[PDB]
């Protein structure tokens, strides 16, 4: 029963001054230029604001699924950031790339880890990301696992080919980073992990 | 123990220090703060901030802490941050506010704490954008009314010229999109 969208949308119209009708009678569709700004990308804000629907009609009207902001983030960096993980799997499942890196050099697995999503970390391996994508500085994800303290994304990082020699630009391992903390940060059972596993 | 062993002297010194080295922990991109923000470790938030570091300090980016545990929603250490004298009238790398992220994320509860520290609800980003422009943007007639409740002005206008309603004019035929419509429209009727 769309009966009540026919009815809002007289119900609105009642509201309208006759200039604004006009505009509302010319955007059928989404505009994208008027709606969109540096800070504001309406993709990012749906996601956010998890309106997956809103998503997809954009989407379907034209808007590339992996339009990429002024730091070069889709909605899927967004997504993860903002730990949206519904959102972060309806957008994977639509096609959205997951191995983009942004003006950073960050990719979806880089913030994934640093918002310690545990799940979407596992989903991301599903696509076969590469785990061992290094950022602008060198960073790779076992490096941000490490700086997160978190010891089960750390492990399945390893357990899923994360290469522990790996340095950042100015030379650290990701062995600095669980020793540097020194007692009362987990540091004992980050710098565990990293000597045994994988195997 | 058993991994201690495969240690040099100079790293087992790192592990039993009774302070962290945070430079070795830091880039630009990821500041250790930021990280155990995001990521929702309290505990370890306030063990970081009892020791020398700036509350305020910015990313490679400009963002700070508050803004980190704000789009994540991590809403107990936002209290925390700002209760912590954190500054919660820092900009963005485009002039926008707290409130526009608190928004964006559609995020109820910081939007009120927020209200509380004295955030301006009409401030304006660098394209004329008030965190409204952005509720109506996010179709979130939830929020949309948080703000008008908490007296968001519907008369100003982003650098297009368009107020919150007419942005909503450009945004497609939608029952969403009408929702807000109606709510912006009758609102200031409300009003006597």
């Not at chain 1, 509302?24 to 230029?33: D, G």
């Not at chain 2, 250790?32 to 990521?39: E, I, K, S």
């Not at chain 2, 990313?59 to 991590?74: E, P």
Request: charge should be neutral; hydrophobic fraction near 40%.
């Amino acid at each position: 029963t769309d009966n009540y969208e026919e009815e809002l949308a007289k119900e609105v119209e009642q509201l309208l001054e006759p200039e604004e009708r006009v505009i509302l009678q010319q955007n059928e569709k989404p505009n994208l230029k008027m709606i969109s700004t540096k800070s504001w990308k309406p993709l990012q804000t749906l996601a956010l604001s998890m309106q997956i629907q809103l998503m997809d009609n954009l989407i379907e009207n034209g808007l590339d699924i992996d339009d990429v902001d002024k730091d070069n983030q889709t909605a899927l960096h967004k997504a993860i950031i903002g730990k949206k993980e519904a959102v972060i799997s309806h957008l994977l499942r639509k096609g959205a790339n997951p191995h983009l890196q942004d003006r950073d050099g960050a990719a979806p697995i880089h913030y994934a880890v640093q918002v310690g999503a545990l799940q979407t970390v596992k989903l991301l391996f599903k696509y076969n990301v590469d785990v061992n994508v290094a950022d602008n500085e060198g960073w790779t994800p076992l490096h941000i696992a490490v700086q997160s303290r978190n010891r089960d994304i750390t492990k399945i990082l390893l357990t899923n080919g994360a290469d522990k020699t790996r340095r950042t630009k100015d030379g650290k391992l990701a062995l600095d980073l669980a020793l540097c903390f020194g007692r009362d940060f987990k540091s004992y059972d980050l710098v565990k992990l990293l000597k045994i596993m994988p195997t | 123990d058993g991994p201690r062993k495969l240690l040099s002297k100079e790293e087992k010194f790192m592990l039993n220090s009774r302070n962290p080295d945070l430079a070795v922990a830091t880039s630009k991109k990821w500041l250790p703060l930021h990280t155990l923000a995001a990521c929702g470790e309290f505990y370890l938030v306030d063990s970081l901030l009892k020791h020398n570091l700036d509350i305020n300090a910015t990313d490679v980016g400009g963002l700070t802490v508050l803004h980190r545990a704000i789009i994540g929603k991590k809403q107990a250490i936002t209290n925390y941050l700002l209760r912590e004298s954190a500054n919660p009238f820092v900009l963005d790398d485009e002039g926008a506010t707290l409130m526009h992220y608190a928004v964006q994320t559609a995020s109820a509860p910081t939007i009120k704490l927020l209200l509380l520290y004295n955030a301006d609800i009409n401030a304006q980003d660098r394209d004329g954008w008030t965190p409204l422009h952005v509720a109506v943007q996010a179709r979130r007639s939830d929020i949309v009314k948080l703000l008008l409740i908490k007296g968001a002005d519907i008369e100003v206008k982003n650098k297009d010229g368009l107020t919150p309603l007419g942005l909503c004019l450009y945004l497609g035929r939608e029952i969403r999109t009408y929702e807000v419509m109606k709510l912006l429209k009758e609102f200031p009727l409300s009003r006597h």
